[PDB]
Structure formats: structure tokens, C-alpha cells
Amino acid sequence: RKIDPSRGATLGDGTPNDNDRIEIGPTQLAFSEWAAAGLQLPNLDRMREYRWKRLTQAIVDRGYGGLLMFDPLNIRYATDSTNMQLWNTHNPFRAVLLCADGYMVIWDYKNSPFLSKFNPLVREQRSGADLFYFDRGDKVDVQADVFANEVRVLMQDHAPGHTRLAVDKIMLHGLRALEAQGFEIMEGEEVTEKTRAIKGPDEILAMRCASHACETAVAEMEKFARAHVGDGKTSEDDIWAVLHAENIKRGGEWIETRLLASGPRTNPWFQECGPRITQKNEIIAFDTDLIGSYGICVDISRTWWIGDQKPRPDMVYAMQHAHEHIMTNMEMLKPGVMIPDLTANCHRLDDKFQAQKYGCLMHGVGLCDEWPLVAYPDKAVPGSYDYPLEPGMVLCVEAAVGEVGGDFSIKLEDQVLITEDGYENLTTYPFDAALMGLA
Amino acid sequence: RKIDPSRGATLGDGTPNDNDRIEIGPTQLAFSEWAAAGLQLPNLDRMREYRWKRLTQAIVDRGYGGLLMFDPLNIRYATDSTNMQLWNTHNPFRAVLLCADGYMVIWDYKNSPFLSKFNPLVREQRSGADLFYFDRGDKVDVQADVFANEVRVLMQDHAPGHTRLAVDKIMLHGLRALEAQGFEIMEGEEVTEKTRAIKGPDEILAMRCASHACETAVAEMEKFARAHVGDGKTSEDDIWAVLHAENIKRGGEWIETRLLASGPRTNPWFQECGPRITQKNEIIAFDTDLIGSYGICVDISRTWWIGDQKPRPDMVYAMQHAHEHIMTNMEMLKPGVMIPDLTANCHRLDDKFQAQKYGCLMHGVGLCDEWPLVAYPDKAVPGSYDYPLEPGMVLCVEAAVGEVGGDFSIKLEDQVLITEDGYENLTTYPFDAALMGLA
Numbered sequence: 002r003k004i005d006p007s008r009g010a011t012l013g014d015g016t017p018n019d020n021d022r023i024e025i026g027p028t029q030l031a032f033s034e035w036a037a038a039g040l041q042l043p044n045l046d047r048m049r050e051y052r053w054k055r056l057t058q059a060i061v062d063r064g065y066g067g068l069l070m071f072d073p074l075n076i077r078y079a080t081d082s083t084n085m086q087l088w089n090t091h092n093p094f095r096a097v098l099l100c101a102d103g104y105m106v107i108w109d110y111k112n113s114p115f116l117s118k119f120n121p122l123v124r125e126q127r128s129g130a131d132l133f134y135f136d137r138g139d140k141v142d143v144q145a146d147v148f149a150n151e152v153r154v155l156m157q158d159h160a161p162g163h164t165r166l167a168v169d170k171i172m173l174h175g176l177r178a179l180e181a182q183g184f185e186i187m188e189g190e191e192v193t194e195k196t197r198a199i200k201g202p203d204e205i206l207a208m209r210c211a212s213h214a215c216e217t218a219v220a221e222m223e224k225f226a227r228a229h230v231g232d233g234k235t236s237e238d239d240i241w242a243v244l245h246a247e248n249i250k251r252g253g254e255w256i257e258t259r260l261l262a263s264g265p266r267t268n269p270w271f272q273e274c275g276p277r278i279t280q281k282n283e284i285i286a287f288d289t290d291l292i293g294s295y296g297i298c299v300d301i302s303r304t305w306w307i308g309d310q311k312p313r314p315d316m317v318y319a320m321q322h323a324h325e326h327i328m329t330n331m332e333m334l335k336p337g338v339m340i341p342d343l344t345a346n347c348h349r350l351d352d353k354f355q356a357q358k359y360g361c362l363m364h365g366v367g368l369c370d371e372w373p374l375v376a377y378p379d380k381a382v383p384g385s386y387d388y389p390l391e392p393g394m395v396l397c398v399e400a401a402v403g404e405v406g407g408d409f410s411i412k413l414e415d416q417v418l419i420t421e422d423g424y425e426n427l428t429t430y431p432f433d434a435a436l437m438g439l440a
Numbered sequence: 441r442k443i444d445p446s447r448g449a450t451l452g453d454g455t456p457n458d459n460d461r462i463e464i465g466p467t468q469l470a471f472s473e474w475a476a477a478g479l480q481l482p483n484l485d486r487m488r489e490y491r492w493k494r495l496t497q498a499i500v501d502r503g504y505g506g507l508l509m510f511d512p513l514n515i516r517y518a519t520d521s522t523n524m525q526l527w528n529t530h531n532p533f534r535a536v537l538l539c540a541d542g543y544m545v546i547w548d549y550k551n552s553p554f555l556s557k558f559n560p561l562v563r564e565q566r567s568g569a570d571l572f573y574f575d576r577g578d579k580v581d582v583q584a585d586v587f588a589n590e591v592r593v594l595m596q597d598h599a600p601g602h603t604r605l606a607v608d609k610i611m612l613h614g615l616r617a618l619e620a621q622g623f624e625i626m627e628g629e630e631v632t633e634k635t636r637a638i639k640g641p642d643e644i645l646a647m648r649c650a651s652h653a654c655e656t657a658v659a660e661m662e663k664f665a666r667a668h669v670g671d672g673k674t675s676e677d678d679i680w681a682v683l684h685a686e687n688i689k690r691g692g693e694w695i696e697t698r699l700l701a702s703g704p705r706t707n708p709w710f711q712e713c714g715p716r717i718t719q720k721n722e723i724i725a726f727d728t729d730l731i732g733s734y735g736i737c738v739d740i741s742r743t744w745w746i747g748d749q750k751p752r753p754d755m756v757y758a759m760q761h762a763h764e765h766i767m768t769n770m771e772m773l774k775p776g777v778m779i780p781d782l783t784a785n786c787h788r789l790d791d792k793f794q795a796q797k798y799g800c801l802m803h804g805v806g807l808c809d810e811w812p813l814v815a816y817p818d819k820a821v822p823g824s825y826d827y828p829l830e831p832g833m834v835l836c837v838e839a840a841v842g843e844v845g846g847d848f849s850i851k852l853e854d855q856v857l858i859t860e861d862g863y864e865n866l867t868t869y870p871f872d873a874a875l876m877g878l879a
């Protein structure tokens with residue numbers, strides 16, 4: 002019956018206290034750690050209502066009649082319902098229509114209409130939005146017309162007079178079928194990215210929980226790495242596997258990249274975690290890029306020195322330079338600052354680090370990496386992100402620091418909330434004391 | 441610095457014996473187990489040439505000038521190059537163009553041109569194919585035109601006279617820009633799915649290795665589950681986490697679904713792995729849906745009974761029925777058989793299992809789930825997959841067996857190669873003896 006005997010009919014996040022329920026979420030392990038940490042749990046019903054209201058408002062503000070979503074991350078934002086998320090990312094079997102009057106319909110996997118029933122804001126569970134060759138072979142086009150006619154009828158009933166339908170991403174068969182029904186297809190991502198960019202109070206609570214769980218998982222990985230690196234057998238993959246397992250054990254969902262590398266494989270950055278046998282007296286740098294508990298992305302980066310010797314002075318300087326970079330850049334953060342002014346006033350990396358610097362100095366984060374992208378001045382494009390920061394935005398602040406042809410790089414990154422009058426760094430994970438020149 | 445001291449300049453798959461190399465792949469753990477199991481390793485160079493030749497021929501055969509791929513799994517097929525695959529699945533930053541003359545170009549993440557340089561069949565490494573709102577904000581359109589003009593010039597030089605460009609999936613800004621350059625956009629998935637459907641000799645060797653690694657990882661998971669289920673603490677997530685870690689430790693890449701469930705959460709099927717505390721004397725059913733070593737998908741399902749008591753008779757019957765289903769259907773497999781004849785002649789499940797049966801009785805598999813999909817008679821669509829099986833195809837054979845309103849389901853699934861004369865079941869994982877009604 003109850004999954005948590007110490008509680009009544011509901012868990013702390015308001016969901017049912019029922020070991021046999023369909024809905025998943027954080028494990029008892031995660032909840033125990035969070036309670037011991039004194040973290041306030043999100044109320045999921047209020048969270049789901051917040052997102053839905055805000056997304057509906059976004060449609061209305063643009064004078065659109067609706068938004069059609071095939072990206073599982075947008076579907077997750079709109080409904081909080083998951084279904085084979087990773088398979089869904091490259092197999093578009095799922096769709097959500099949200100109309101300007103708030104009416105929301107999901108076309109789900111035929112076999113699994115029950116996966117969104119926990120959210121009453123999802124008014125209908127249908128099927129048949131899977132318009133790709135694996136699922137339908139030479140008969141995609143017939144179903145594309147069935148599906149587009151369904152969307153037409155829903156829009157006639159729930160957004161009469163509107164011809165503009167925003168779509169995040171759709172297969173060409175789907176696009177043509179919708180256009181044949183008389184829709185003008187608008188850019189759906191411009192709707193979803195800007196909506197998702199402002200977190201409500203429950204999303205922020207959810208993120209604090211996910212962040213705590215992610216930092217716990219990383220601490221397990223550090224413990225494992227410092228204990229086993231340089232034993233002649235332990236690989237990058239061995240270390241990284243710890244993060245995978247500890248995330249899953251806390252109700253997390255997946256990891257977006259393979260960004261953990263050791264020794265000379267840290268420079269250039271973006272070499273992937275693999276079989277390399279790790280060594281004593283070497284750098285290990287990683288980036289969590291992690292979809293964690295409550296489906297919230299925790300995106301932080303740390304660089305470790307592991308060995309009996311001291312790190313080289315150039316490693317210490319680089320680490321200190323990287324730290325100075327993100328602390329200076331996050332100090333720019335407060336409501337009302339224009340994104341291009343972040344670009345213009347950002348901390349200046351030394352010349353020898355300019356060539357291999359990161360693809361941005363900041364980016365948004367929520368269910369994954371999100372709008373905005375804050376480019377360095379030499380890559381920034383005029384008229385691309387002319388908007389101010391607002392309370393409720395969350396930005397990761399980045400530093401990649403390495404020389405061309407060098408044998409190491411530093412990667413640091415913290416996750417930062419915009420508050421009413423400034424910012425709050427959510428990330429508490431320590432910086433390697435030897436690399437920081439403190440030890 | 442060799443990663444394998446017992447070898448010369450190359451590893452057994454022909455790749456460099458170099459601990460510090462960029463290229464990732466199977467771990468020393470995986471290679472060690474495969475050697476002990478007596479498995480011949482693929483030659484990756486010949487594998488990569490096989491795929492590239494076959495895909496180029498597919499373009500030529502259709503009278504197209506090129507194939508443009510944004511799906512990371514098609515990119516993986518064409519180049520064997522990974523780059524944040526999971527991030528890529530829902531962030532289309534990457535693109536590969538293959539022209540009718542075999543000329544092949546990748547547009548990669550700006551910061552990482554080196555990630556595909558190990559494959560000399562990739563002739564150029566460019567950037568700027570990232571046409572989505574996160575990456576470019578309100579200036580996607582400008583870059584979409586830059587990108588489309590580059591594709592035009594390449595097609596002019598390497599497929600002159602062709603206007604037909606196959607595209608698997610592209611953002612609408614990209615579609616509009618390509619059509620503005622005079623391209624007729626063809627269905628790219630019809631090209632990629634049919635090409636990937638036939639595995640060459642080295643791909644089959646890679647799949648044998650991946651299958652062995654995955655089966656090893658599942659055996660670790662089974663050991664964990666049988667030792668810890670019913671301790672009042674161990675969750676579905678705890679058990680599943682073992683598969684995650686053991687896959688990563690062997691050079692695997694990710695898991696596509698969350699299909700592991702315990703007790704009453706197995707019925708209906710497609711309930712996701714979650715926080716449920718597992719119980720003694722209960723069914724656990726799961727589906728690996730796993731992207732494993734060498735990036736090969738291993739897609740198998742097993743159902744376990746764990747407890748001091750015997751399974752109920754209806755459980756044993758359902759298991760035997762499920763096993764009979766896949767063995768009977770698998771027996772249909774040999775070259776020349778038309779896919780809808782598989783549909784027409786499949787084993788018939790008992791009436792009480794029909795309503796909740798699986799979405800297909802078979803589907804292709806390679807780098808992930810692939811064409812064809814073999815539907816049950818009541819879902820099959822005429823003219824959707826009118827094609828014969830061929831040697832080198834690999835099909836998973838499925839069984840979901842459960843009653844409406846029931847408190848358990850069985851899920852069984854094996855991965856089967858089509859041979860010159862018939863079939864070869866690649867899957868050797870045991871079936872639960874107690875559920876099979878054996879002492």
C-alpha cells in the first residue's frame with residue numbers, strides 16, 4: 002500500500018502515497034536525503050498548473066490559436082508526463098496540442114494512454130501522431146492526413162478563427178498535412194523556449210532538490226575516482242558509471258553528453274568519456290549535463306586533480322582563472338540586464354585561452370539546456386537575443402580554459418538563479434582545493 | 441602509451457592501441473570478456489566503408505543527388521562518429537551530407553571538429569548547421585540560408601544536375617532555406633531505414649559483441665535483484681541502475697526506455713521504472729532497449745519470478761504462452777518471406793491476451809529500433825511494408841502477455857539474425873525456470 006509508512010495519503014510533494022501507483026518520481030532514497038537536508042518539496046499539482054497556465058498565456062500573447070509539440074522535453078514541460086523519453090527524442094511517436102483556450106490533448110503511444118492520466122489538465126488521450134518511416138513505412142502520409150484533420154477539428158472547436166499554429170518540430174509529412182488543412186505554421190520553439198525560461202516557485206523547489214541529488218551523485222563519483230584512479234585498471238567509463246547509477250537510484254532520468262575526460266584527453270575539450278585507463282597525477286574534468294530528479298536538469302562542471310604530487314603551476318593558474326571567469330560573469334546577473342550587455346561586459350579570458358573558450362559564457366537551464374544562449378563577443382550575433390533577464394530564470398555560467406596544443410583544460414560551471422534583486426548561486430559543490438591553490 | 445600492453449600497434453578491431461586517443465569504444469573489460477567468450481571482433485574500418493558504400497548506393501539507386509541527415513542515429517550510421525548523442529537527439533546541431541559520388545561532409549559542433557577525423561570517409565568538418573532557437577535565437581533564418589547555400593554548392597560540385605535531396609528530418613527554417621535553393625526534398629528515412637536494414641559482416645560481429653556485453657550486464661542486474669528484492673528498501677530504480685552502470689563500464693552508450701517494472705506495475709505494460717519498493721513473491725519484467733558496445737542496440741526482454749514461493753499457475757501458463765509465441769513466430773523467419781505474410785501467419789495469442797498484446801510481433805534492430813515493423817493482423821496496414829526478408833536483417837521477436845485488469849504481465853523478447861538459409865537467434869539469456877514451469 003503506502004510507499005512511505007510515516008506519511009498519510011500523500012507524499013510531501015502532494016502525490017499519492019501508493020507503492021503500486023503508475024506515476025514515478027524521486028525515490029525514497031532521494032526523499033530521505035532531501036528531508037535530512039531540510040529542503041522544501043515542490044507541490045507537483047501547483048507546478049503543473051503553473052507551466053500550463055504560462056504556456057497557454059504564451060500562445061495567447063502571440064495571437065496564435067495553438068501550439069503543437071513533438072519534442073519530448075516540451076511535452077514534459079506541458080504535461081509533466083514521460084514515456085520512453087530517450088526513444089521519443091529520435092522517434093516522434095508523441096504529440097501534445099495546447100489550444101489558446103487552454104484545452105490540451107496528447108496523442109500517445111497506442112499501448113499507453115494511461116501514462117498522462119495523473120495530470121487532469123490533459124483532457125484527452127489519443128493516438129496516431131507517429132508520422133515516421135519505422136512506425137508506418139510507406140503509409141505515413143495516410144495517417145498524417147488523419148492526424149492533421151484531428152488537429153483542425155480541435156482548433157475549430159477550441160481556437161475558432163485562428164489559422165496560426167505554432168509547432169516546435171514536425172516531420173515533413175506532418176507539416177504538409179497540417180498546411181493542407183489551412184494552418185499557417187509558426188515557430189514553436191520561440192514559444193516554448195521563452196515560456197520555459199521563467200521558473201515558477203515549485204519548479205525552483207524541484208530544481209533545488211534535483212541539484213542536491215546531483216551533487217550527492219557527483220560526490221559518490223569523486224569518492225570512487227580518488228580511491229581508484231591510477232590503479233592501472235580504472236577507466237573514464239568506470240568513474241562516469243558511478244554518476245549514472247547514483248542518478249538513477251535517486252529517480253533521475255539520463256545524462257545528455259559524455260563529457261568526462263582524463264589527462265591529455267581534456268584538451269581540446271569535448272572529447273568523450275571512454276575506455277582510457279586513468280592515471281595518478283592527472284587532471285580529470287567533467288560536466289554533469291544531467292537530467293535528474295523531478296526531470297530537472299542539473300548542469301555543473303568541476304575539474305579534479307588526483308595524485309600524490311602537486312598540480313603544475315599552470316594548472317593552478319588556469320583553474321583560478323576559470324573560477325574568476327564564472328564568479329565575475331555571474332556577478333553581472335540581475336533582473337533587467339539585457340542579454341547582449343552580458344556579452345559585452347563579460348570577463349576577459351587571457352589571450353592564450355581565447356581560441357578554445359566555450360561556445361557560450363552562459364545558457365538557460367530547466368528540463369535541459371534552454372534559451373537564452375549568451376555568446377562571447379566574438380561569436381555573438383546582433384538581434385538574436387535582445388531581451389532582459391527576469392526573476393525565475395536560471396542560467397549556467399561557464400568556463401573552459403585551455404591552451405592550443407596544451408595537455409590539459411579546466412572546465413567549471415555553476416547553476417545560477419535570477420532572484421527579485423539579483424542572483425543566487427544554486428551550486429554548492431566544492432572546487433578542488435589543490436587546483437585552486439589553497440591546499 | 442598502449443591501452444593494451446599485450447598487443448601491437450592496433451587493437452583487435454583494427455583501431456589504434458593508444459590510451460590517449462580521441463576515439464572511444466569498448467573498454468578493456470569488454471574486450472577481455474569477448475576474448476574469453478571466443479568472439480571475433482569487427483574490423484571497424486571495413487564496417488565503416490561497408491555502411492558508406494551501401495548508403496551511397498541507396499542514393500544512386502533512387503536517382504537522388506544526396507542525403508542530408510540530422511538524426512544522430514543516421515549520422516552514427518554514416519560516419520560512426522558520436523558527439524553528445526543524447527543531447528543531439530533533441531538539439532539538431534549536427535548534420536551530414538552524403539552526395540551521389542560518395543563525397544561526405546559533416547557540420548559538427550563548432551568547438552569539436554576533431555570528433556569525426558578518425559573516419560577519412562568524412563571529407564570535411566564544418567560548422568553552422570545548428571538551426572534551432574536555443575542555439576541562434578531570433579537569427580536562425582540568417583544561418584539557415586548560409587547553411588542551405590553551402591549544401592547547394594556541395595551538391596553542385598558533387599551531384600551536378602540533381603535537384604532531389606533526401607532529408608531525414610530538419611527544422612522548418614532549414615526546410616524553407618533548402619527549398620529556396622531549388623531542392624526537391626525527398627523522404628530521407630525511406631533511404632536510411634532500408635539501407636540500415638541489411639547488416640554487413642562487421643556490423644554482425646559488432647552486434648554479437650554488443651549482445652554478449654548486454655547479456656553480461658543483465659546477469660549482473662539479475663544477481664542484484666535476486667539478492668536484494670524484498671528487503672523492504674530495494675526499488676525498481678535500484679535494480680535498473682545496475683544495467684545502466686554495467687553497460688557504461690563496457691563502453692555502452694544509453695538506454696532508450698524505462699521499461700522495468702515490478703509486481704502489479706507490469707500490467708498494463710509500459711509503466712515505467714520508478715521508486716516502487718520491490719516485494720518477495722513477485723514478478724519483475726523488463727526490456728533492455730539498450731544502446732550498447734560499438735553503439736549497437738541490444739533489445740531483449742525477460743520476466744523474472746523472485747520469491748520463496750512458487751509462481752501462480754496463471755503466471756506459469758502466461759510465461760509458457762509468451763515463450764511459445766516468440767519461438768513459433770521466429771520459426772517463420774528466412775529470406776524471401778514477405779513481411780505481411782509474417783503478419784498473416786503469426787502465432788495467435790489466447791483471446792484473453794489479445795487486447796493488451798504488444799504493438800508489433802517483430803521489428804528491425806541495428807543502432808536502435810529500425811524498420812521494418814511487423815504489425816499484428818488487427819493493426820497491420822496494407823501497402824505499408826510490402827518487402828521480403830533478406831540475409832543480414834536483424835529482427836527482435838516480441839511477446840507481451842497479460843489480461844485486462846490483471847495483476848501481472850509477461851514480457852519476452854529475443855534478437856534474431858536472418859541468415860542465408862533461415863535464422864539465427866542471437867539471444868542466449870536464460871528463461872526463468874520457475875515461470876517456465878520447470879523445477
Ligand SMILES: [Fe+3]
Nearest residue numbers: 288290300301
Ligand atoms: Fe554542462
Ligand SMILES: [Fe+3]
Nearest residue numbers: 300397399414
Ligand atoms: Fe552548461
Ligand SMILES: [Fe+3]
Nearest residue numbers: 727729739740
Ligand atoms: Fe524491447
Ligand SMILES: [Fe+3]
Nearest residue numbers: 739836838853
Ligand atoms: Fe523490441
